[PDB]
Amino acid sequence: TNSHGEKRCTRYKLQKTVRERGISPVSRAIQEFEEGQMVHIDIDPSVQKGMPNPKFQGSTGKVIGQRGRSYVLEVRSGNAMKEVFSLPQHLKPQKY
Amino acid sequence: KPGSMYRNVRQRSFTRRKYMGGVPGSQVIHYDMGDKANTSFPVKISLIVEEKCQIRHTALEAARITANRHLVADTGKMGFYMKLRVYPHEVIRENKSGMRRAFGKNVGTAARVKPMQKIFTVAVEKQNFKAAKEALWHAGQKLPTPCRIVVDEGAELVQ
Amino acid sequence: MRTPIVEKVIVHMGVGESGQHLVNAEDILRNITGQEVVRCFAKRTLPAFSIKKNEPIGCKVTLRGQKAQEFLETALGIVEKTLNRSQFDSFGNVSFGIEEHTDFPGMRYDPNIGVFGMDVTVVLKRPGERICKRRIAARKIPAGHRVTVDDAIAFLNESYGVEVM
Amino acid sequence: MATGPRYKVPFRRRREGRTNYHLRLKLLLSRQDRVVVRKSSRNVQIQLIAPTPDGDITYSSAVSNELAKYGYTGATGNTTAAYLTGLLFGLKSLQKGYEGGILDIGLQASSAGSRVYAALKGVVDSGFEIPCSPEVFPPDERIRGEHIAGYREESSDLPEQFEATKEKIFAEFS
RNA sequence: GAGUUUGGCGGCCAUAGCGGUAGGGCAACUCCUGUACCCAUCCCGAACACAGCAGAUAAGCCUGCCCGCGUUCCUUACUGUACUGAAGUGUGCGAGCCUUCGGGAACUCUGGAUCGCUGCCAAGCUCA
RNA sequence: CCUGGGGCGGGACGCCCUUGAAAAGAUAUCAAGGGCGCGCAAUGGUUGACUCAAGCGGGUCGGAAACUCGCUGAAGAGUGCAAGAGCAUAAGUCAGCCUGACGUUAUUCAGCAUAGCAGUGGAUGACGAGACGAAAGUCGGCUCUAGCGAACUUUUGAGCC
RNA sequence: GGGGAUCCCUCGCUCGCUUGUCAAACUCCAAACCCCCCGUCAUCCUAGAAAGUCGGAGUCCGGACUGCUGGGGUA
Ligand SMILES: [Mg+2]
Ligand SMILES: [Mg+2]
Ligand SMILES: [Mg+2]
C-alpha cells in the first residue's frame, strides 16, 4: 500500500540546485517582516527545523504575527484559510 | 509468438535493467560488417523507416544475415562496410490465472524506432551501387515496417 | 629567501605487531632521539599479517631543527650519506629504511633487542609555509614555489655533502 | 577545482578563507550589534558592525595607531596597547550613542590572557556593556609592563607611560 | 571638499573557478627572529599564544595580459523545426496523423564577449 | 472480509519511502521496487581540533595483503537498519566536561487537499529547573520522513475529596 | 585476469581519445497548459456581495464520446 506520511512525493520538491547545495546565504535568515506584508513560501531543504508542510510550496500568504522566531502566515488552500508557522529562512518577500 | 503481438507503441518504455529481472540474451553477434579499417567509400546509402514500431532482435538478425550474404556474394569481402545502428534496449513481457495479477514476465528484447530514422548503412564503390541497392532491398523484406532507401553521400555521383 | 631548507624529519618505527617489541621500540627511540614518541594504530583487522582493528603497530617522532640536523648528520654518516634514486622522490623526500639499530652511535647491543628496522625521511621546502597551513587565510603553494629534485641534491651536497647516486 | 558543470565552488569569503558562515549565522540571531577585534602584528583593530541587506554598516572603528596623539610611544603589538585601544574605543562608542553588542573573535583561538581578551577588559572597564565572564580577563601583572621583562629588562619605562596614556584617554573622552 | 592606495566587516555566490605569464611594497599587510611569562602538542613553539628588532618582495596580497579547460551572454543556421493550448462533417484497415488562430525549445553551427561587479567605515595621502 | 464468479493461493486487512500521476493540489487495480512491528549509557548533549573515498610517487620478505611521508581530491566517504532527501571550519572523525533520553501547559499543521472524523505525532511557543561554552547560542534523545492501540478493568506514584 | 623455471610472449575485464544507440523509478538543460498573490479592465452587487445560524432531504450499482503514445492485457 502507498504510505501517507508527511514527506511523500518530495523527491524533486525538496532538492537543492547543483550550484546551491551546502550552506545557504545567511542574510536570508535575518530578514524582518511587518504586519500585512505579502510573502512567498520557498522551502529551503538545508534547514531541518521550522519547515511547513511542503504542500504549501509556491503559495503566497500574508503575515499575521510573530511567535518567537517564526511568523504566522495565512495561506489559502482550495477555499479554506490555513495558518502556517514558518521561520523567516523559508520565506521571501514580494517585489512590487 | 507472432510478429504483430509486439510491434505497436502503445505504452511507456520499460528498459531499466536493475529493476526488472531475468531478461534473456540476444542473437545478434556483431554490429559492424565488412572492412572496418577502410574509410574511403564515396557512396553511403542507408535503409530508413516510414513508421514507428518495435523490431524484435530476431528480425534484425535475419535482416543482417541476408544483407551480409548478398553483399559478400556480389560486391566482395573487402568492397563494403555495413553497420547496424539500433540496439535493442526495450524488454518484452508475455503474461503466463486469467486476468488475476495479469502483469507479465520478461520474454525478449526489442528496439524501438522513429519515422525517417536510419537502421542500416552500406558504403561501396561506384561500380557496386546497384548491388548495394539489391542487398538493402532484401533486408527490408524481413523487417516489420515499410522501408525506403536513401542515398546519403555521393548522390551526384550515382545520380 | 628561496633556498630549499629542510622542513622536518619523521622517524617511523614499525613493529608488525604490538607488545614488548613495540614498547622497547619506543624505549630505544626515546634513547636515540631525546624525546618521547607516539604509537600508531591499525585501520582494520588483517589476520594474514596477524593484525587486528585499532591495535597499536608502530612508533613515530617528528623531531625538527637542530634535532633534525643532528639526526640527519648521524644517519648520513651511518649509511655513508650516499643516497640512490630509489628512495628519492619528486620533492627531494628521501625514505631510506635501514633495519639494524645498534649501528647508531650509543646503542648498546642487547640479545633480546638485537635488531629493529626503521626508516628515515626528510621533507624539503622553500621559505614560506605559513600560507598553506595557518588557520587564517590558508592558501596553497604555487608550482613555481615548489621544490625540485636537482635543487634538493644541490642543497644536500652544499649543506652536508650529501652525495646522491 | 572547476572540472565540469556539476562542480560546486565555495563562497568568495570562503575561498579567501577569512570567514566562518556557521558562526556568522549563530551571531546574527542575537538581533544586536557585534564587536570585531581582529588583530595583526604591527597593531590591533576594534570596530562595531551591524548587518544590512546590502552590506555591513559600521558605526565606530578605533585603531591602536591612534595612541600616537596621546603619547603611547611604546610597542603597538603588546597587550597594554590592546587595553588602551579598547578603552578609548569604549569611551568613543559610549559618547557616540551605542553601548552594547556581542563579542566576536572570528576565526581566532579564545585563550585566556590573549590580546583579544585584553581589548575585552578595556571595553568592559569603560562602561560599554557587553556579556562576558571575568575568568578569561588577563591579570594586570602582564598588562602593566611585565610580559616583556625577561628579555627587555633594559626597557621598563612602561608603567608611567601606561598611567599617563590612561589619564589622557580619560581626559579627552570626558 | 573629489580622487587614489592600504586595512577590516560584507551583498550577489564560477561573468567570480582551473591553468599560464610579466611587473610592486614608501605608508599598510605578509613572509619573517625566539620561547621569560598566559597558552600547546594523542611527540614536535608545526599549528595556536606571546615577545619582536633584522632582511625580502622569492611566496600570500595588488596591477596588466593569455581562449588554453570549465561557467555566463549575444548573434547566423538548424527553425518558427520538435513539442503544445483551443475549434474542426479534415484523414488512416489499424497503432496514428493533418488544417486554422495562439505559444515555442534543447543540443549542434558561423562569429564575438566573460580572467568578477559592488556596500560601509578607518588610516595615510594627494586639492582648494 | 477482499477476490476480473466462489474455492485454492495470498493479505494489496495497521504504518514508512520511490515510480505510476499527465511540471499547483487530488487520483484506481490481486499495479512495479520495497521495508517496518527494532537496536544503543552510548551508537546521546555541548565545546575544541581536524578532513573523508580512490588513485599517483618512496620506504625492510610489512609480496601485487598491512604502517608511514608527499601530491591530486566539493565528497566519488561516513551519518545504526528500507527508499528518497540533507550535511565540509559540517549533520562526519577523535578528545575534554556532562545527562535536555527533564516536570507542567497553549495553539497550528497532517492523519482526514478542497471538506466533517480517536489516539497520536511535529512545528512553534509559555512556566520551573539545568549541561556545555568568553559569549552568541545549541540541547524536549540517536540529520528528516516508519518502529504502534479507545472505553471498561487491575496494579503503581504525589496530594487531596 | 584466461590461454599453455626467465611466467619464453600471447592477452579478455578495465582506464583515456574518437564513432553508434538508450532510460518509468537518469538529468548540465527545458516548454505549452496549470496554481498562489498584486495592479488594471470586465461582469455580479444595498431590489443585498462575502460570511454565519437553523429546518427538510435524496445519493455512496453508473454509462458514454473527445484528448492524456494514460496503467494492465495478445487483443
Ligand atoms: Mg465473499
Ligand atoms: Mg442508500
Ligand atoms: Mg459529447
Author numbering:
A (entry chain BR): 2 to 97
B (entry chain BI): 4 to 99, 111 to 173
C (entry chain BF): 1 to 165
D (entry chain BN): 1 to 174
Task: Quote the study that presented this structure, word for word.
pmcRibosomes are essential macromolecular machines responsible for protein synthesis. Here, we report the cryo-electron microscopy (cryo-EM) structure of the ribosome from Methanosarcina acetivorans, a previously unreported high-resolution structure from a model mesophilic methanogenic archaeon.
To investigate the rRNA modification of ribosomes isolated from methanol- and acetate-grown cells, particularly around the peptidyl transferase center (PTC), we increased nominal resolutions of the 50S subunit ribosomes by combining particles containing 50S subunit (either 50S subunit alone or 50S within the 70S form) and obtained resolutions at 2.38 Å from methanol-grown cells and at 2.85 Å resolution from acetate-grown cells. Only a modest difference in RNA modification profiles were observed between the ribosomes isolated from methanol-grown and acetate-grown cells. Compared to those from acetate grown cells, 50S ribosomal subunits from methanol-grown cells do carry two additional modifications: G2260 has a 2′-O-methylation (Gm2260) and G2615 has an N7-methylation (m7G2615), which is positioned near the PTC. In addition, the similarity of the combinatorial ROC AUCs for 50S between growth substrates further supports the overall similarity of the ribosome structure in these two conditions. Our comparative cryo-EM analysis of ribosomes isolated from methanol- and acetate-grown cells revealed nearly identical structures of rRNAs, consistent with our previous in vivo DMS probing study.
